[PDB]
């Protein structure tokens, strides 16, 4: 169901066998014998219910909303336009939320996937994190409990504010 | 029901708290206003009438 453009995975490579030794494999036999006594029952289950499943098979839709003006664009004191912009504002922040989250998860798989060698392959799931959470600090940071779209302006403003100030010299 | 439901309901609750609100702060300025310098229907403070007085010639010539 996932894929690999949001989950990025680097393709396997396992070694083949090359058993130098005449013993024989524990490891082998008991996954044959795993798979002979509870893998192929469960998938004969499993494909009992996926053709159930095709029998009453149903859709659903990823709901999406369209771009209500921005609080920028909005009058103060005129509570309809505030309401909208800060909904959407809202809604934002909570896609913000889970981005962070998915690129948390990428640096996870990243190090874990390394082992030994996670402070020389993970420099570009490293570099993503550090720019995404430079940004969310830029946008989101010390708001407070009661965050809001008219906080993140006024952040916002000032942070540019300060950047044209350092700009002139 | 649905979130556009609950969306346009608080929409039209805003609208209505938003304009009870301006018309509250119009009617304090207007009693403000009003009560500085009477001049419509409100904190208009009595005067003698002037139908309980007397236009009749009188004994007296000087009046």
Known sequence: SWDKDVYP??????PAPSPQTSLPNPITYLTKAYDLVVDWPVTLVR????????????????????????????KEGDVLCIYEAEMQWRRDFKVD?????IIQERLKACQQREGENYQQNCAKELEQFTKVTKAY????????AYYSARK????????MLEERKAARQ | DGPEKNYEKTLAILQIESEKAELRLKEQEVRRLMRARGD?????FPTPEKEFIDHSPKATPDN
């Open chain 2, 40 to 44: 419509g229907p409100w904190y208009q």
């Open chain 1, 152 to 159: 993140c302006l006024a952040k916002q403003k000032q942070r």
């Open chain 1, 97 to 101: 939320q889970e981005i962070m989250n």
């Open chain 1, 47 to 74: 494909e009992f219910i996926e053709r159930q499943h095709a029998k009453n098979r149903t859709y659903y839709y990823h709901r999406q909303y369209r771009r209500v003006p921005d609080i920028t664009e909005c």
């Open chain 1, 137 to 144: 600090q830029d946008r989101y940071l010390d708001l407070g």
């Open chain 1, 9 to 14: 995975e680097p393709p396997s490579r396992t």
